[PDB]
Amino acid sequence: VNQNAQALNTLVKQLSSNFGAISSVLNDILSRLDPPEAEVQIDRLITGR
Amino acid sequence: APGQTGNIADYNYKLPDDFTGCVIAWNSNNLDSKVGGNYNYLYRLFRKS
């Protein structure tokens, strides 16, 4: 039971990691920078997650 | 520039990201220029979107 709790817990907490981007929430990045410069940060976030 | 903003880029024409050519320019000041300004050509400075 501890390996499933610790596995699911790490699985959720990795969403809070930024993975090299400006912020972990997609609304702050999509609501500020333009879409062509922003798509690079989205590809780095998808690859990390 | 492809995928870059600007006054004429946003409000008139923006180059697509698939553009493979060279940006080639030539000086027309000895032909297209007129005394007191050339009113033949136009441009749209403002637009609602």
Short mmCIF file of N, CA and C in Angstrom, two decimals:
data_model
loop_
_atom_site.label_atom_id
_atom_site.label_comp_id
_atom_site.label_asym_id
_atom_site.label_seq_id
_atom_site.Cartn_x
_atom_site.Cartn_y
_atom_site.Cartn_z
N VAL A 1 0.84 -1.20 0.00
CA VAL A 1 0.00 0.00 0.00
C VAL A 1 0.87 1.25 0.00
N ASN A 2 2.03 1.21 0.68
CA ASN A 2 2.89 2.39 0.67
C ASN A 2 3.49 2.64 -0.71
N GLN A 3 3.89 1.60 -1.47
CA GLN A 3 4.39 1.89 -2.82
C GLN A 3 3.30 2.48 -3.72
N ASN A 4 2.02 2.04 -3.62
CA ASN A 4 1.05 2.78 -4.44
C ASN A 4 0.80 4.20 -3.95
N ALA A 5 0.80 4.43 -2.63
CA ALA A 5 0.57 5.79 -2.17
C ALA A 5 1.73 6.69 -2.55
N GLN A 6 2.96 6.22 -2.36
CA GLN A 6 4.13 7.01 -2.72
C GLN A 6 4.26 7.17 -4.23
N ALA A 7 3.78 6.20 -5.03
CA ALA A 7 3.88 6.31 -6.48
C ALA A 7 2.87 7.31 -7.02
N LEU A 8 1.65 7.27 -6.49
CA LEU A 8 0.62 8.21 -6.92
C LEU A 8 0.97 9.61 -6.44
N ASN A 9 1.52 9.72 -5.23
CA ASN A 9 1.92 11.01 -4.68
C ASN A 9 3.04 11.66 -5.51
N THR A 10 4.09 10.91 -5.88
CA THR A 10 5.09 11.48 -6.79
C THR A 10 4.47 11.83 -8.15
N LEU A 11 3.53 10.98 -8.62
CA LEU A 11 2.89 11.20 -9.91
C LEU A 11 2.11 12.50 -9.91
N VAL A 12 1.49 12.87 -8.78
CA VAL A 12 0.77 14.13 -8.74
C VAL A 12 1.75 15.29 -8.55
N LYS A 13 2.74 15.15 -7.63
CA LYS A 13 3.65 16.27 -7.34
C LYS A 13 4.50 16.68 -8.54
N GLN A 14 4.71 15.79 -9.52
CA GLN A 14 5.51 16.23 -10.66
C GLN A 14 4.79 17.30 -11.50
N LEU A 15 3.46 17.46 -11.35
CA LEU A 15 2.75 18.54 -12.04
C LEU A 15 3.15 19.90 -11.51
N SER A 16 3.55 19.96 -10.24
CA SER A 16 3.97 21.22 -9.67
C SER A 16 5.39 21.58 -10.08
N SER A 17 6.18 20.62 -10.57
CA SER A 17 7.51 20.98 -11.01
C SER A 17 7.39 21.77 -12.31
N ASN A 18 8.25 22.76 -12.45
CA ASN A 18 8.21 23.65 -13.61
C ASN A 18 8.82 23.08 -14.89
N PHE A 19 9.78 22.16 -14.77
CA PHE A 19 10.52 21.51 -15.87
C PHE A 19 11.22 22.47 -16.85
N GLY A 20 11.75 23.59 -16.36
CA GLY A 20 12.44 24.54 -17.22
C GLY A 20 11.64 25.66 -17.85
N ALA A 21 10.38 25.82 -17.50
CA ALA A 21 9.50 26.84 -18.05
C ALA A 21 9.38 28.05 -17.12
N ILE A 22 8.53 28.99 -17.50
CA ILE A 22 8.36 30.19 -16.68
C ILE A 22 7.53 29.85 -15.44
N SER A 23 6.44 29.12 -15.61
CA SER A 23 5.57 28.76 -14.49
C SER A 23 4.95 27.40 -14.77
N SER A 24 4.50 26.74 -13.69
CA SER A 24 3.89 25.43 -13.83
C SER A 24 2.44 25.48 -14.28
N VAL A 25 1.79 26.63 -14.15
CA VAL A 25 0.41 26.77 -14.57
C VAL A 25 0.41 27.26 -16.01
N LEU A 26 -0.35 26.58 -16.86
CA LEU A 26 -0.38 26.96 -18.27
C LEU A 26 -1.08 28.29 -18.52
N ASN A 27 -1.99 28.72 -17.64
CA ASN A 27 -2.67 29.99 -17.88
C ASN A 27 -1.77 31.21 -17.74
N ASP A 28 -0.75 31.16 -16.87
CA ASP A 28 0.13 32.33 -16.77
C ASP A 28 1.05 32.44 -17.97
N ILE A 29 1.45 31.31 -18.55
CA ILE A 29 2.32 31.39 -19.71
C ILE A 29 1.50 31.72 -20.97
N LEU A 30 0.32 31.10 -21.14
CA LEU A 30 -0.48 31.38 -22.33
C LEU A 30 -1.13 32.76 -22.29
N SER A 31 -1.29 33.34 -21.10
CA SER A 31 -1.90 34.66 -20.97
C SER A 31 -0.91 35.81 -21.04
N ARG A 32 0.39 35.54 -21.21
CA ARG A 32 1.38 36.62 -21.27
C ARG A 32 2.18 36.61 -22.57
N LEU A 33 3.03 35.61 -22.80
CA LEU A 33 3.87 35.61 -23.98
C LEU A 33 3.04 35.26 -25.23
N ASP A 34 3.54 35.66 -26.41
CA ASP A 34 2.85 35.38 -27.66
C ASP A 34 2.90 33.87 -27.97
N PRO A 35 1.94 33.35 -28.74
CA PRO A 35 1.92 31.90 -29.13
C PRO A 35 3.15 31.33 -29.85
N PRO A 36 3.78 32.00 -30.84
CA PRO A 36 5.00 31.39 -31.41
C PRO A 36 6.19 31.31 -30.47
N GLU A 37 6.40 32.28 -29.60
CA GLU A 37 7.52 32.11 -28.68
C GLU A 37 7.11 31.17 -27.56
N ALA A 38 5.82 31.14 -27.24
CA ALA A 38 5.27 30.33 -26.16
C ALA A 38 5.26 28.83 -26.47
N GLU A 39 5.15 28.45 -27.76
CA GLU A 39 5.07 27.03 -28.12
C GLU A 39 6.33 26.26 -27.75
N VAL A 40 7.48 26.94 -27.65
CA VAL A 40 8.72 26.27 -27.26
C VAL A 40 8.61 25.87 -25.79
N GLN A 41 8.03 26.75 -24.96
CA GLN A 41 7.90 26.45 -23.55
C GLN A 41 6.86 25.35 -23.37
N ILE A 42 5.83 25.33 -24.23
CA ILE A 42 4.86 24.23 -24.11
C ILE A 42 5.49 22.90 -24.51
N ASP A 43 6.33 22.87 -25.56
CA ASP A 43 6.98 21.60 -25.89
C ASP A 43 7.94 21.11 -24.82
N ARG A 44 8.63 22.03 -24.13
CA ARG A 44 9.46 21.59 -23.01
C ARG A 44 8.62 21.08 -21.83
N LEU A 45 7.47 21.70 -21.58
CA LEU A 45 6.60 21.21 -20.51
C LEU A 45 5.99 19.85 -20.83
N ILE A 46 5.55 19.62 -22.09
CA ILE A 46 4.95 18.32 -22.42
C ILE A 46 6.01 17.24 -22.32
N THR A 47 7.22 17.49 -22.86
CA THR A 47 8.27 16.48 -22.81
C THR A 47 8.67 16.15 -21.37
N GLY A 48 8.71 17.14 -20.47
CA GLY A 48 9.06 16.84 -19.08
C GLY A 48 7.98 16.04 -18.37
N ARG A 49 6.72 16.47 -18.52
CA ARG A 49 5.61 15.75 -17.89
C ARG A 49 5.43 14.37 -18.53
N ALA B 1 9.68 39.33 -40.58
CA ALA B 1 10.23 38.08 -40.06
C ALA B 1 9.09 37.09 -39.85
N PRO B 2 9.28 35.81 -40.16
CA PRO B 2 8.22 34.81 -39.98
C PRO B 2 7.84 34.65 -38.51
N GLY B 3 6.53 34.68 -38.24
CA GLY B 3 6.02 34.47 -36.90
C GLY B 3 6.36 35.56 -35.90
N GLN B 4 6.68 36.76 -36.37
CA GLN B 4 7.01 37.88 -35.50
C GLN B 4 6.00 39.00 -35.69
N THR B 5 5.74 39.72 -34.60
CA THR B 5 4.75 40.78 -34.59
C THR B 5 5.32 42.09 -35.13
N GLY B 6 4.48 43.11 -35.13
CA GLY B 6 4.85 44.43 -35.61
C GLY B 6 3.60 45.17 -36.05
N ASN B 7 3.82 46.43 -36.45
CA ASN B 7 2.70 47.25 -36.92
C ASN B 7 2.16 46.76 -38.25
N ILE B 8 3.03 46.62 -39.25
CA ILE B 8 2.57 46.10 -40.54
C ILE B 8 2.46 44.59 -40.51
N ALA B 9 3.13 43.94 -39.55
CA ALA B 9 3.09 42.49 -39.47
C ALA B 9 1.73 42.06 -38.93
N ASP B 10 1.30 42.68 -37.84
CA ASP B 10 0.03 42.31 -37.24
C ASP B 10 -1.13 42.89 -38.04
N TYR B 11 -1.05 44.18 -38.41
CA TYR B 11 -2.21 44.83 -39.01
C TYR B 11 -2.33 44.64 -40.51
N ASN B 12 -1.28 44.21 -41.23
CA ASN B 12 -1.39 44.07 -42.68
C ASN B 12 -1.05 42.67 -43.17
N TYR B 13 0.23 42.28 -43.16
CA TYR B 13 0.65 40.98 -43.66
C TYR B 13 1.76 40.43 -42.78
N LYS B 14 1.64 39.17 -42.39
CA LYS B 14 2.67 38.48 -41.62
C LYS B 14 3.16 37.28 -42.43
N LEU B 15 4.48 37.13 -42.49
CA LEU B 15 5.08 36.02 -43.23
C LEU B 15 4.81 34.70 -42.52
N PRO B 16 4.44 33.65 -43.24
CA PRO B 16 4.19 32.36 -42.59
C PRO B 16 5.50 31.70 -42.16
N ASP B 17 5.37 30.75 -41.23
CA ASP B 17 6.51 30.01 -40.71
C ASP B 17 7.13 29.04 -41.72
N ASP B 18 6.46 28.79 -42.84
CA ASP B 18 6.90 27.91 -43.91
C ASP B 18 7.71 28.67 -44.97
N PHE B 19 8.03 29.94 -44.73
CA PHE B 19 8.70 30.79 -45.73
C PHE B 19 10.17 30.40 -45.83
N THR B 20 10.53 29.90 -47.02
CA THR B 20 11.89 29.49 -47.33
C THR B 20 12.71 30.48 -48.13
N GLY B 21 12.16 31.60 -48.56
CA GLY B 21 12.87 32.44 -49.49
C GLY B 21 13.84 33.38 -48.81
N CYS B 22 14.38 34.29 -49.62
CA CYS B 22 15.29 35.33 -49.18
C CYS B 22 14.46 36.60 -49.12
N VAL B 23 14.75 37.49 -48.19
CA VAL B 23 14.06 38.77 -48.25
C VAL B 23 14.97 39.71 -49.04
N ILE B 24 14.54 40.02 -50.26
CA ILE B 24 15.33 40.76 -51.23
C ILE B 24 14.67 42.11 -51.39
N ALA B 25 15.46 43.17 -51.34
CA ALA B 25 14.97 44.53 -51.46
C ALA B 25 15.78 45.28 -52.50
N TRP B 26 15.15 46.30 -53.08
CA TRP B 26 15.81 47.14 -54.07
C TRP B 26 15.31 48.57 -53.86
N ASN B 27 16.21 49.52 -54.11
CA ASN B 27 15.96 50.92 -53.79
C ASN B 27 15.18 51.54 -54.94
N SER B 28 13.95 51.97 -54.66
CA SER B 28 13.08 52.54 -55.67
C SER B 28 13.06 54.07 -55.68
N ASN B 29 13.90 54.73 -54.86
CA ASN B 29 13.84 56.18 -54.66
C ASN B 29 14.03 56.99 -55.94
N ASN B 30 14.64 56.41 -56.98
CA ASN B 30 14.83 57.10 -58.24
C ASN B 30 13.66 56.91 -59.20
N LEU B 31 12.65 56.14 -58.81
CA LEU B 31 11.52 55.85 -59.68
C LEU B 31 10.19 56.14 -58.99
N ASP B 32 9.87 55.38 -57.94
CA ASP B 32 8.55 55.47 -57.31
C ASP B 32 8.36 56.75 -56.51
N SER B 33 9.44 57.44 -56.16
CA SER B 33 9.33 58.65 -55.36
C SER B 33 8.81 59.81 -56.20
N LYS B 34 7.97 60.64 -55.59
CA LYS B 34 7.40 61.80 -56.27
C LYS B 34 7.61 63.04 -55.41
N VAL B 35 7.47 64.20 -56.06
CA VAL B 35 7.64 65.48 -55.37
C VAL B 35 6.45 65.72 -54.45
N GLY B 36 6.73 66.06 -53.20
CA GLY B 36 5.66 66.28 -52.24
C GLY B 36 5.00 65.04 -51.71
N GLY B 37 5.62 63.88 -51.87
CA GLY B 37 5.03 62.64 -51.41
C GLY B 37 4.36 61.88 -52.54
N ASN B 38 4.36 60.56 -52.41
CA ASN B 38 3.74 59.67 -53.39
C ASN B 38 2.44 59.15 -52.80
N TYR B 39 1.32 59.59 -53.36
CA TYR B 39 0.00 59.21 -52.89
C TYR B 39 -0.58 58.03 -53.66
N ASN B 40 0.16 57.49 -54.63
CA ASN B 40 -0.30 56.32 -55.38
C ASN B 40 -0.39 55.09 -54.49
N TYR B 41 0.70 54.74 -53.81
CA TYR B 41 0.65 53.64 -52.86
C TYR B 41 -0.07 54.05 -51.58
N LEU B 42 -0.55 53.04 -50.85
CA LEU B 42 -1.32 53.24 -49.64
C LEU B 42 -0.82 52.27 -48.58
N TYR B 43 -1.28 52.48 -47.34
CA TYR B 43 -1.15 51.46 -46.31
C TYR B 43 -2.23 51.68 -45.27
N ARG B 44 -2.62 50.59 -44.60
CA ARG B 44 -3.65 50.63 -43.57
C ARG B 44 -2.92 50.56 -42.24
N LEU B 45 -2.92 51.67 -41.49
CA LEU B 45 -2.19 51.68 -40.23
C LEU B 45 -2.98 51.02 -39.10
N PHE B 46 -4.30 51.21 -39.06
CA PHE B 46 -5.11 50.73 -37.95
C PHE B 46 -6.19 49.77 -38.45
N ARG B 47 -6.52 48.79 -37.61
CA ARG B 47 -7.61 47.88 -37.87
C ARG B 47 -8.12 47.40 -36.52
N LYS B 48 -9.41 47.01 -36.46
CA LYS B 48 -10.02 46.56 -35.21
C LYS B 48 -9.39 45.28 -34.66
N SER B 49 -8.76 44.47 -35.50
CA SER B 49 -8.14 43.23 -35.04
C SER B 49 -6.99 42.85 -35.97
#
